Amino acid sequence: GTHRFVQKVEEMVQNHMTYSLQDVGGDANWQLVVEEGEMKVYRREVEENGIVLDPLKATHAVKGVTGHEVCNYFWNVDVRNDWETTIENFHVVETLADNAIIIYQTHKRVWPASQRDVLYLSVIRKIPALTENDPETWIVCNFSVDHDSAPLNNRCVRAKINVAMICQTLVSPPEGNQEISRDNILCKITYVANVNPGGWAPASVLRAVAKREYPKFLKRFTSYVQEKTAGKPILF
Ligand SMILES: CCCCCCCCCCCCCCC(=O)N[C@@H](CO)C[C@@H](O)c1ccccc1
Numbered sequence: 001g002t003h004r005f006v007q008k009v010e011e012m013v014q015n016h017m018t019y020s021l022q023d024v025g026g027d028a029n030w031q032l033v034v035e036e037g038e039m040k041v042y043r044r045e046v047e048e049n050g051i052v053l054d055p056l057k058a059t060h061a062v063k064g065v066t067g068h069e070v071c072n073y074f075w076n077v078d079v080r081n082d083w084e085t086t087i088e089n090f091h092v093v094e095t096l097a098d099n100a101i102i103i104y105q106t107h108k109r110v111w112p113a114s115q116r117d118v119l120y121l122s123v124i125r126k127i128p129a130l131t132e133n134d135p136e137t138w139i140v141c142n143f144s145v146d147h148d149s150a151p152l153n154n155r156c157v158r159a160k161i162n163v164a165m166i167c168q169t170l171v172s173p174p175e176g177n178q179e180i181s182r183d184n185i186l187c188k189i190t191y192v193a194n195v196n197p198g199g200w201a202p203a204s205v206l207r208a209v210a211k212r213e214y215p216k217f218l219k220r221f222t223s224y225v226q227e228k229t230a231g232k233p234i235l236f
Contacts, residue, residue: 003096064182067167071138117156135168
């Protein structure tokens, strides 16, 4: 694209493709904090200046949906209020391109602390596969940016985020005369969130809230995509 954030977008996407896809199950810096079905949520305990920064990584596998579909739903602001439960208000600050926008939103007070807001560029991209034997990758990157129309608030502490939802479709076509159905596709998801709360709060509580809220979102959101796509032609 030609918008002013193209280089930053490419950098963020590249960093996610190399660092975020790395296997974390046998990485002792990480702890498996939540497991349920195909869902696993891991976190790395990190603080700077007493502020909790814990990188979060979740993996999931969702039957019957494609990575394109999952990423479309996650990115599309027109369905945001259908699945998101942690937001108070949001609006689009600017539209940069057909696949890239800047969003301002305030969050419900889930932490024992002041309300947080956030101002982020949200971009959906396809990373082509090197071979037809591999899956294409779809990724939505949400990362903080500044904008003149959304300066610091008087009432809210400005959090900073670097989040990616990265998805690949696996297909297992049926053995004979049948056409591929949704019974034959599975979406592998890696979701990474690095959130800087923008000020101090008790780590024990922030960690409990993350352990509760991320798996709640992932189940609700993935269920939503399953419901909304059920019975429709497959969007690879
Ligand atoms: C950033 C403000 C922090 C206040 C909220 C505390 C963390 C609560 C856990 C929320 C988990 C659900 C995340 C769904 C999620 O990814 N939400 C999208 C769409 O609203 C924006 C996003 O990429 C984001 C991620 C993490 C935190 C905030 C926003």
